[PDB]
Amino acid sequence: RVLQLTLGNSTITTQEAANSVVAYGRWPEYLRVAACRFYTLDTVSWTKESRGWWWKLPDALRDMGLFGQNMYYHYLGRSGYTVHVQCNASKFHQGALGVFAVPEMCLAGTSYQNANPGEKGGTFTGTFCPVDYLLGNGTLLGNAFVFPHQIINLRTNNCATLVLPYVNSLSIDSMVKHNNWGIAILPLAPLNFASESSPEIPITLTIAPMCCEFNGLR
Amino acid sequence: RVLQLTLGNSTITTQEAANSVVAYGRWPEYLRVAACRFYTLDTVSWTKESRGWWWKLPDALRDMGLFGQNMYYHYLGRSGYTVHVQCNASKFHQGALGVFAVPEMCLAGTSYQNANPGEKGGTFTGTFCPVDYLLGNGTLLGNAFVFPHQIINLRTNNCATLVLPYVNSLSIDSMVKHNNWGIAILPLAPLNFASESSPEIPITLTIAPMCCEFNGLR
Amino acid sequence: RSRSESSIESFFARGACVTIMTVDNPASTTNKDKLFAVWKITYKDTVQLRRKLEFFTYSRFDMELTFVVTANFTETNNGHALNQVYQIMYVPPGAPVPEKWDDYTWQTSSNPSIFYTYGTAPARISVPYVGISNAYSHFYDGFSLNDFGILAVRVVNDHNPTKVTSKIRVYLKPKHIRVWCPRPPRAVAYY
Amino acid sequence: RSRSESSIESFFARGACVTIMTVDNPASTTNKDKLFAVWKITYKDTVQLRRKLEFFTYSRFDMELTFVVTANFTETNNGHALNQVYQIMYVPPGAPVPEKWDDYTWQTSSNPSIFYTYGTAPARISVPYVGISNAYSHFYDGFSLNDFGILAVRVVNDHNPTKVTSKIRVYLKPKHIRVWCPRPPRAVAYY
Amino acid sequence: GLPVMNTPGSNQYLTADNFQSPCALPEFDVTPPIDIPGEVKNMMELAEIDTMIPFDLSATKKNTMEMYRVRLSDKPHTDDPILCLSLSPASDPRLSHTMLGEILNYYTHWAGSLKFTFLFCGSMMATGKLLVSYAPPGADPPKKRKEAMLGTHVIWDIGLQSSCTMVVPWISNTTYRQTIDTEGGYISVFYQTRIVVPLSTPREMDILGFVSACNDFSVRLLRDTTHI
Amino acid sequence: IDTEGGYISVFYQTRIVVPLSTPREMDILGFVSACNDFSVRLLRDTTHI
């Protein structure tokens, strides 16, 4: 089984949408078109020495196509997302990732360009760069599995999916000023591999806005 | 398909009960509760140099839980068994085992502690220790495939199952004095493996009495 | 089996002191600007309520404030004073705060005020949800904290001979709580 | 959408202080005619209520008066005094006003009087609409202001040894308001 | 008697309290009311009234009759606007003084739509085109006629209709804005065409400007800041 | 607080087999959670400074 998903002028090859977590059980919904497509970010290399990676949302897509154009040329907007993490590796690599979606992921070691990496995303550290096992804020990472999450354990699966509804104190809000979601991908178990295998496996993120809607155009 | 068998306070993970030989076609049967559970023995390491292994029954379970307690605190008893041999290896190992269940497996190079190894089981040799290709008694091992048997050929399967009914000249008999079955696991083809793979693969036995019944308690 | 005491209402709605506001009598000797006390309502000071609220991201709650006033003469001097009255003024969000003892805010119709007579039942009000947003944000990943209001306190009696200090304990009890989006709880470390 | 808080009742009916009436104890030392305090009820003093009423030309409203009495000894002297009682007399329109402490108006059956015992709940009455006209005129383009009444205040205890000053805050809350014929609101300039 | 238990809050006077109270004149027959014209049941009814915007708050113009008139003249056809009015009805000194602003100063929060109404007070003969633009919140106001035209706008014809009623919408992240500090939009009027006149008719006309809340407007959380 | 309650405990039944030069040092993680039958009572906040 190999599903070939499509959104407009974009196509993605998912092994299967078997493990697809919906954050807090709520599917994205409008308030009771073209921007909502697959935007695949620049891959990051997971090595033995990695501590983690993190992107914000909608900050990650501030430059991507219409979801960037609209996100600037409007004032207010809301959007759910579909973060698809593909971590294609061999059968002779081993490790685990924890993909955690975090509402209002306020990081701490704080000045807009600092907490808004954009497309490339930031990285954690193990002692700016926030701490890996803390997620910046003093917070034991074990308890981090409260958040909407999924485990990419290479021995069994090599891709996760996260459907994220719009989560904010407001019905609609300015996307330029204020992020809603924060994706953090941290290695629960370290990478390891056979003798001379590819020593750094790639992690790819495919973000797809869902129920993207904005007001008011200038 | 991964079946997860259970007997009381014990659970076993069988890949599939596809190849499950019933010795002589007869299922265990009472004479026309708690002791009947999974007792998993201490694993034995199959190397390149192995000649074979053998356990008796019910001698192997003389110390295991209630099937040992009862087996001593009673005088007469009968029991069928379910010997499950798991020989988990990689796809880069190769070899074959012959699991043979042998009624009245009288061995020969003879003094109770000698022919009653118990939990650990004995081993064969290639020249005490009985001979591998003879099974102690002068007996060509090829013809040994008359016995209730199954071949664990690592290229296709890596576990066998043997359902053993109660086989004796008597309806019921003293388990302390006299064994009924003898399991002998002999390498038909030798172990071999790729360059620096795990050089000795483990063989595990899970014995499960069936229709265990005894008289008379002291 | 019963999960009532682990309900949000039971876990949160529990009378917890959040400040101790000290005010002196308007004595005409040398008194500083300690004649009145002002405290912006905020849970970020008491660790118990804060650590319980930071389990969760968003929130909504009415806020029952009880006021326990306790006074005493300062000087060993032969102290005498008629029963004092305390103006406990709640200042809603976005409103001006008192700067002086005789500022106009103490006469503003907007600002609701309690007139607690000393030696009686503890004063009380019930602030409703006063959020512009539809939920109090405990964590906000954006650029330009939430305003609950201010509590100001003074003695009403003016030309008093003997000094009288007074502490106003504020027992805040959140009522009708709702909380969304749980989070890992912070250690007690950075509090 | 909701326009409740911009209703006339919500906009106007809010407890606002309108005066602070000071009275001294009938001490026999040298006390002047400060033994009693008199204040004609008028909104033309407090700017908040006045500026809100002068949005509109005519009006009608009951008038709930609350009285917060706060006393204190004047002298640093070893002050002692039993609990004082205050006569808070409302004088309707067209009635005579007290001239002296022991005038007859304090014994008149007409004039309703409250006897507030110090150190208890604030006194209160509810004056009804006392207008000869069918609406209070805030602006009148004619030739010959509206009379709401007078509030007089005294201490009832008479032969007191130690002086005791006392301030009576009058918190007027108009209730059941109606207003007609809106107008431009005055600047804060001439107030 | 009935055993009671006086709770906390007893004997306190909360100025926001609403209890019954004893009437001092209980035998007095109140003067009955009459049907006066003009009963106001709500304050927003006063903010729904088109009141005139003071555009020129300069040193001389202010506190006169000239502070309201916007003078259209004949001068080099500069792309800059005739007027640019920020939509901070409370935090804009021009709209702050209108009736709307006077009612908003009494409140903290507000939400709804505004309707602006410009009015040509020139000659019956004069003809021309103005362009009435509305930049939405967050936008930096239009500096040239082109930038304004591309956005929302109304080409008002001075010759045909003498007024132009553009209605602003309710765009805010919160359900309610504040009355103090941060954007809210910009009305702005440009010449599309320099105003034509016939014979010796004066080439200096005036436009007035009005503002009013709409039926969707609402305020909350009273905040009187009046003092001396 | 304080006295027993049991012990989870993980043993090797068989030393872990691997194919070719694959690393012979793996990791196991461990998770815990209450079940639907779980309940608590008598709140006791011990948080202070």
PDB file of N, CA, C and O in Angstrom, chain A residues 115-154:
ATOM      1  N   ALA A 115      12.899  34.013  18.359  1.00  0.00           N
ATOM      2  CA  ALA A 115      11.881  32.980  18.501  1.00  0.00           C
ATOM      3  C   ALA A 115      11.076  32.763  17.225  1.00  0.00           C
ATOM      4  O   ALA A 115       9.950  32.257  17.291  1.00  0.00           O
ATOM      5  N   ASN A 116      11.620  33.141  16.072  1.00  0.00           N
ATOM      6  CA  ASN A 116      10.952  32.967  14.782  1.00  0.00           C
ATOM      7  C   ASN A 116      11.990  32.546  13.754  1.00  0.00           C
ATOM      8  O   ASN A 116      12.393  33.336  12.893  1.00  0.00           O
ATOM      9  N   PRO A 117      12.457  31.299  13.821  1.00  0.00           N
ATOM     10  CA  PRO A 117      13.449  30.843  12.841  1.00  0.00           C
ATOM     11  C   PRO A 117      12.928  30.825  11.430  1.00  0.00           C
ATOM     12  O   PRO A 117      13.699  31.066  10.493  1.00  0.00           O
ATOM     13  N   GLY A 118      11.652  30.535  11.249  1.00  0.00           N
ATOM     14  CA  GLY A 118      11.073  30.520   9.923  1.00  0.00           C
ATOM     15  C   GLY A 118      11.178  29.153   9.304  1.00  0.00           C
ATOM     16  O   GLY A 118      10.840  28.148   9.925  1.00  0.00           O
ATOM     17  N   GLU A 119      11.668  29.118   8.069  1.00  0.00           N
ATOM     18  CA  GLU A 119      11.635  27.893   7.284  1.00  0.00           C
ATOM     19  C   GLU A 119      12.618  26.867   7.821  1.00  0.00           C
ATOM     20  O   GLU A 119      12.299  25.676   7.900  1.00  0.00           O
ATOM     21  N   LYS A 120      13.816  27.304   8.192  1.00  0.00           N
ATOM     22  CA  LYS A 120      14.863  26.360   8.555  1.00  0.00           C
ATOM     23  C   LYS A 120      14.633  25.746   9.924  1.00  0.00           C
ATOM     24  O   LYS A 120      15.070  24.618  10.174  1.00  0.00           O
ATOM     25  N   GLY A 121      13.966  26.460  10.814  1.00  0.00           N
ATOM     26  CA  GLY A 121      13.771  25.991  12.161  1.00  0.00           C
ATOM     27  C   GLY A 121      15.029  26.119  12.996  1.00  0.00           C
ATOM     28  O   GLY A 121      16.136  26.301  12.496  1.00  0.00           O
ATOM     29  N   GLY A 122      14.832  26.024  14.306  1.00  0.00           N
ATOM     30  CA  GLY A 122      15.920  26.053  15.252  1.00  0.00           C
ATOM     31  C   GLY A 122      16.334  24.657  15.673  1.00  0.00           C
ATOM     32  O   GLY A 122      15.861  23.648  15.158  1.00  0.00           O
ATOM     33  N   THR A 123      17.251  24.622  16.630  1.00  0.00           N
ATOM     34  CA  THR A 123      17.759  23.384  17.188  1.00  0.00           C
ATOM     35  C   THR A 123      17.887  23.525  18.693  1.00  0.00           C
ATOM     36  O   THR A 123      18.066  24.621  19.225  1.00  0.00           O
ATOM     37  N   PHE A 124      17.798  22.392  19.370  1.00  0.00           N
ATOM     38  CA  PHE A 124      18.003  22.316  20.802  1.00  0.00           C
ATOM     39  C   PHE A 124      19.469  22.028  21.098  1.00  0.00           C
ATOM     40  O   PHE A 124      20.266  21.739  20.204  1.00  0.00           O
ATOM     41  N   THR A 125      19.819  22.119  22.378  1.00  0.00           N
ATOM     42  CA  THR A 125      21.138  21.752  22.862  1.00  0.00           C
ATOM     43  C   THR A 125      20.972  20.966  24.156  1.00  0.00           C
ATOM     44  O   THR A 125      19.857  20.773  24.647  1.00  0.00           O
ATOM     45  N   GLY A 126      22.095  20.502  24.700  1.00  0.00           N
ATOM     46  CA  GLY A 126      22.091  19.601  25.839  1.00  0.00           C
ATOM     47  C   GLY A 126      22.798  20.133  27.066  1.00  0.00           C
ATOM     48  O   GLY A 126      23.420  19.367  27.808  1.00  0.00           O
ATOM     49  N   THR A 127      22.709  21.435  27.300  1.00  0.00           N
ATOM     50  CA  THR A 127      23.319  22.029  28.482  1.00  0.00           C
ATOM     51  C   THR A 127      22.798  23.443  28.740  1.00  0.00           C
ATOM     52  O   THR A 127      22.642  24.240  27.815  1.00  0.00           O
ATOM     53  N   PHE A 128      20.847  31.614  20.167  1.00  0.00           N
ATOM     54  CA  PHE A 128      20.608  30.746  21.311  1.00  0.00           C
ATOM     55  C   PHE A 128      20.185  29.363  20.872  1.00  0.00           C
ATOM     56  O   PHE A 128      19.986  29.098  19.686  1.00  0.00           O
ATOM     57  N   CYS A 129      20.039  28.493  21.856  1.00  0.00           N
ATOM     58  CA  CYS A 129      19.507  27.159  21.661  1.00  0.00           C
ATOM     59  C   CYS A 129      18.879  26.717  22.979  1.00  0.00           C
ATOM     60  O   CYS A 129      19.588  26.657  23.992  1.00  0.00           O
ATOM     61  N   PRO A 130      17.586  26.415  23.039  1.00  0.00           N
ATOM     62  CA  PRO A 130      17.034  25.902  24.291  1.00  0.00           C
ATOM     63  C   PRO A 130      17.471  24.468  24.528  1.00  0.00           C
ATOM     64  O   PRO A 130      18.045  23.808  23.661  1.00  0.00           O
ATOM     65  N   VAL A 131      17.198  23.992  25.737  1.00  0.00           N
ATOM     66  CA  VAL A 131      17.654  22.673  26.143  1.00  0.00           C
ATOM     67  C   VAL A 131      16.722  21.619  25.568  1.00  0.00           C
ATOM     68  O   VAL A 131      15.505  21.819  25.470  1.00  0.00           O
ATOM     69  N   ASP A 132      17.298  20.480  25.189  1.00  0.00           N
ATOM     70  CA  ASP A 132      16.517  19.418  24.564  1.00  0.00           C
ATOM     71  C   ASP A 132      15.557  18.773  25.555  1.00  0.00           C
ATOM     72  O   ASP A 132      14.344  18.733  25.322  1.00  0.00           O
ATOM     73  N   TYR A 133      16.075  18.276  26.678  1.00  0.00           N
ATOM     74  CA  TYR A 133      15.231  17.578  27.640  1.00  0.00           C
ATOM     75  C   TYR A 133      14.315  18.514  28.411  1.00  0.00           C
ATOM     76  O   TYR A 133      13.505  18.027  29.207  1.00  0.00           O
ATOM     77  N   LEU A 134      14.424  19.829  28.208  1.00  0.00           N
ATOM     78  CA  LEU A 134      13.541  20.794  28.842  1.00  0.00           C
ATOM     79  C   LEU A 134      12.536  21.425  27.892  1.00  0.00           C
ATOM     80  O   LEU A 134      11.474  21.840  28.343  1.00  0.00           O
ATOM     81  N   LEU A 135      12.822  21.474  26.592  1.00  0.00           N
ATOM     82  CA  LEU A 135      12.034  22.269  25.646  1.00  0.00           C
ATOM     83  C   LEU A 135      12.088  23.743  26.043  1.00  0.00           C
ATOM     84  O   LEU A 135      11.072  24.438  26.082  1.00  0.00           O
ATOM     85  N   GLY A 136      13.292  24.205  26.370  1.00  0.00           N
ATOM     86  CA  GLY A 136      13.510  25.577  26.769  1.00  0.00           C
ATOM     87  C   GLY A 136      13.025  25.852  28.181  1.00  0.00           C
ATOM     88  O   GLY A 136      13.836  26.039  29.088  1.00  0.00           O
ATOM     89  N   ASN A 137      11.710  25.855  28.383  1.00  0.00           N
ATOM     90  CA  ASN A 137      11.147  25.999  29.720  1.00  0.00           C
ATOM     91  C   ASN A 137      11.506  24.811  30.604  1.00  0.00           C
ATOM     92  O   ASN A 137      11.593  23.683  30.127  1.00  0.00           O
ATOM     93  N   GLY A 138      11.733  25.057  31.892  1.00  0.00           N
ATOM     94  CA  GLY A 138      12.041  23.969  32.796  1.00  0.00           C
ATOM     95  C   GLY A 138      10.918  22.951  32.823  1.00  0.00           C
ATOM     96  O   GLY A 138       9.874  23.173  33.443  1.00  0.00           O
ATOM     97  N   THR A 139      11.124  21.820  32.149  1.00  0.00           N
ATOM     98  CA  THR A 139      10.040  20.880  31.878  1.00  0.00           C
ATOM     99  C   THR A 139      10.627  19.522  31.521  1.00  0.00           C
ATOM    100  O   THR A 139      11.142  19.358  30.417  1.00  0.00           O
ATOM    101  N   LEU A 140      10.473  18.534  32.397  1.00  0.00           N
ATOM    102  CA  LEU A 140      10.982  17.194  32.122  1.00  0.00           C
ATOM    103  C   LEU A 140      10.366  16.640  30.846  1.00  0.00           C
ATOM    104  O   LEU A 140       9.146  16.658  30.677  1.00  0.00           O
ATOM    105  N   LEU A 141      11.219  16.163  29.935  1.00  0.00           N
ATOM    106  CA  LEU A 141      10.754  15.817  28.597  1.00  0.00           C
ATOM    107  C   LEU A 141       9.854  14.590  28.610  1.00  0.00           C
ATOM    108  O   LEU A 141       9.057  14.394  27.690  1.00  0.00           O
ATOM    109  N   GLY A 142      10.004  13.725  29.602  1.00  0.00           N
ATOM    110  CA  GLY A 142       9.085  12.613  29.733  1.00  0.00           C
ATOM    111  C   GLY A 142       7.650  13.081  29.780  1.00  0.00           C
ATOM    112  O   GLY A 142       6.806  12.671  28.977  1.00  0.00           O
ATOM    113  N   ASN A 143       7.390  14.032  30.667  1.00  0.00           N
ATOM    114  CA  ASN A 143       6.060  14.607  30.760  1.00  0.00           C
ATOM    115  C   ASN A 143       5.659  15.334  29.482  1.00  0.00           C
ATOM    116  O   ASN A 143       4.468  15.576  29.272  1.00  0.00           O
ATOM    117  N   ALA A 144       6.609  15.629  28.591  1.00  0.00           N
ATOM    118  CA  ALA A 144       6.309  16.209  27.289  1.00  0.00           C
ATOM    119  C   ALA A 144       5.372  15.346  26.463  1.00  0.00           C
ATOM    120  O   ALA A 144       4.763  15.837  25.510  1.00  0.00           O
ATOM    121  N   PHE A 145       5.237  14.066  26.807  1.00  0.00           N
ATOM    122  CA  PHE A 145       4.313  13.216  26.073  1.00  0.00           C
ATOM    123  C   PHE A 145       2.855  13.487  26.436  1.00  0.00           C
ATOM    124  O   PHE A 145       1.963  12.769  25.977  1.00  0.00           O
ATOM    125  N   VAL A 146       2.588  14.513  27.252  1.00  0.00           N
ATOM    126  CA  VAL A 146       1.224  15.029  27.359  1.00  0.00           C
ATOM    127  C   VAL A 146       0.798  15.683  26.058  1.00  0.00           C
ATOM    128  O   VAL A 146      -0.380  15.649  25.685  1.00  0.00           O
ATOM    129  N   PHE A 147       1.734  16.309  25.362  1.00  0.00           N
ATOM    130  CA  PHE A 147       1.386  17.097  24.206  1.00  0.00           C
ATOM    131  C   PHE A 147       0.897  16.198  23.075  1.00  0.00           C
ATOM    132  O   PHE A 147       1.167  14.995  23.072  1.00  0.00           O
ATOM    133  N   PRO A 148       0.166  16.749  22.107  1.00  0.00           N
ATOM    134  CA  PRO A 148      -0.144  15.982  20.904  1.00  0.00           C
ATOM    135  C   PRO A 148       1.123  15.540  20.211  1.00  0.00           C
ATOM    136  O   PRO A 148       1.899  16.379  19.744  1.00  0.00           O
ATOM    137  N   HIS A 149       1.343  14.234  20.141  1.00  0.00           N
ATOM    138  CA  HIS A 149       2.645  13.716  19.782  1.00  0.00           C
ATOM    139  C   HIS A 149       2.509  12.446  18.968  1.00  0.00           C
ATOM    140  O   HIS A 149       1.415  11.916  18.765  1.00  0.00           O
ATOM    141  N   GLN A 150       3.657  11.963  18.513  1.00  0.00           N
ATOM    142  CA  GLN A 150       3.764  10.657  17.890  1.00  0.00           C
ATOM    143  C   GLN A 150       5.228  10.262  17.860  1.00  0.00           C
ATOM    144  O   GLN A 150       6.109  11.114  17.706  1.00  0.00           O
ATOM    145  N   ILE A 151       5.474   8.969  18.014  1.00  0.00           N
ATOM    146  CA  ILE A 151       6.820   8.424  18.089  1.00  0.00           C
ATOM    147  C   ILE A 151       7.134   7.781  16.749  1.00  0.00           C
ATOM    148  O   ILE A 151       6.412   6.895  16.284  1.00  0.00           O
ATOM    149  N   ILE A 152       8.223   8.237  16.138  1.00  0.00           N
ATOM    150  CA  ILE A 152       8.786   7.631  14.940  1.00  0.00           C
ATOM    151  C   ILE A 152       9.883   6.686  15.412  1.00  0.00           C
ATOM    152  O   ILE A 152      10.997   7.119  15.685  1.00  0.00           O
ATOM    153  N   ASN A 153       9.567   5.402  15.519  1.00  0.00           N
ATOM    154  CA  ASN A 153      10.520   4.377  15.934  1.00  0.00           C
ATOM    155  C   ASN A 153      10.905   3.590  14.691  1.00  0.00           C
ATOM    156  O   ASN A 153      10.126   2.791  14.175  1.00  0.00           O
ATOM    157  N   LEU A 154      12.134   3.810  14.231  1.00  0.00           N
ATOM    158  CA  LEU A 154      12.603   3.345  12.934  1.00  0.00           C
ATOM    159  C   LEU A 154      12.457   1.845  12.731  1.00  0.00           C
ATOM    160  O   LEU A 154      12.343   1.382  11.594  1.00  0.00           O
TER     161      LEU A 154
END
